[PDB]
Amino acid sequence: ELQEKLIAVNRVSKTVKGGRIFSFTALTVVGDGNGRVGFGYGKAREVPAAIQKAMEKARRNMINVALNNGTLQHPVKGVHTGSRVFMQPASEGTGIIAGGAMRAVLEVAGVHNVLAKAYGSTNPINVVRATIDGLENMNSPEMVAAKRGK
RNA sequence: AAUUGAAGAGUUUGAUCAUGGCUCAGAUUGAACGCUGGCGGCAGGCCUAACACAUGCAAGUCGAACGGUAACAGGAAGAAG
């Protein structure tokens, strides 16, 4: 019931004294399938150590999302660095139809059938960060009615 | 009951993030070309030279408008084997 999946692995470099030194970065997202989404970055010298650090950071640093029946509630826009992201609840608008690196976080998030369209930059490290910010500041009808009295 | 509706990716760098262009994945067509080709249904078929046109048809009808008889088939009368 953990439901982990990796989005992006890259080879970064460092350029020391004698030549270059190549390191690998993972970027994974875990989530239970009912709210509870996390992402982790993690970087290491080989690929399986990188993904393992990424999963291990992603299992902690996990955020609650106030889902609807199987989906979002109201249309929400989350931004991070250069990466602007729209989402629309699509009240059984079948299938998760999101961009790459947004399909994954929305998939393990437990949502099933939203409509997305990322704008701006679509770097995978910042398009999540713009989905969680997004799903984090999406509030439910029992939270809005809690705030404003009824 | 009559709008249930939105996906990205590759490429600037030793690597990064951003900006930014180029390019790809889709659908479409009065299409052409290449390879191949069994049947049917429904549609479509000179986008260019509003260039030049052989030949055949594409606008005739009415005698219940009229003088009339060129034919065709009868009618009447005459003459002949």
Query: For A10-42, what is the HEC assignment?
Result: EEEECCCCCCCCEEEECCEEEECCCCCEEEECC
Measured CA A19 to C1' B26 distance, in angstroms? 45
Tell me whether residue A19 is exposed, middle or buried, using C-beta atoms within 10 angstroms of its C-beta: 0 to 12, 13 to 18, 19 or more.
Answer: exposed
* A9 contacts A51 by C-beta, under 8 angstroms: yes
Nearest CA-CA partner of A105 in A74, A69, A65: A65
What experiment produced this structure? cryo-EM
Encoding tokens for residue A127? 């398009």
Instruction: Using the structure block, give the residue that is written with the tokens 């999302």.
Output: A65
Positive or negative, the Cα torsion across A129, A35, A55, A28?
negative
3-state secondary structure of A47: helix
Residues present in chain A in total: 150
Resolution, rounded to a tenth of an Å?
3.4
Taking the C-alpha atoms of residue A44 and residue A143, their distance in angstroms, rounded to an integer, is 41
Residue type, position A13, single letter? S
Q: What angle do CA A90, A96, A100 make, to 5 degrees?
A: 125
Q: Which of residues 36-75 of A touch strand B (CB under 7 A)?
A: none
For chain A, percent helix, then strand, then coil, each to nearest 5?
25, 25, 50
Tell me whether residue A149 is exposed, middle or buried, using C-beta atoms within 10 angstroms of its C-beta: 0 to 12, 13 to 18, 19 or more.
Answer: exposed
Tell me whether residue A31 is exposed, middle or buried, using C-beta atoms within 10 angstroms of its C-beta: 0 to 12, 13 to 18, 19 or more.
Answer: buried
Q: Is the CB of A15 under 7 A from strand B?
A: yes
Measured CA A105 to C1' B1 distance, in angstroms? 37
List, in sequence order, every residue forming a beta bridge with A138; answer none if it has no partner: none
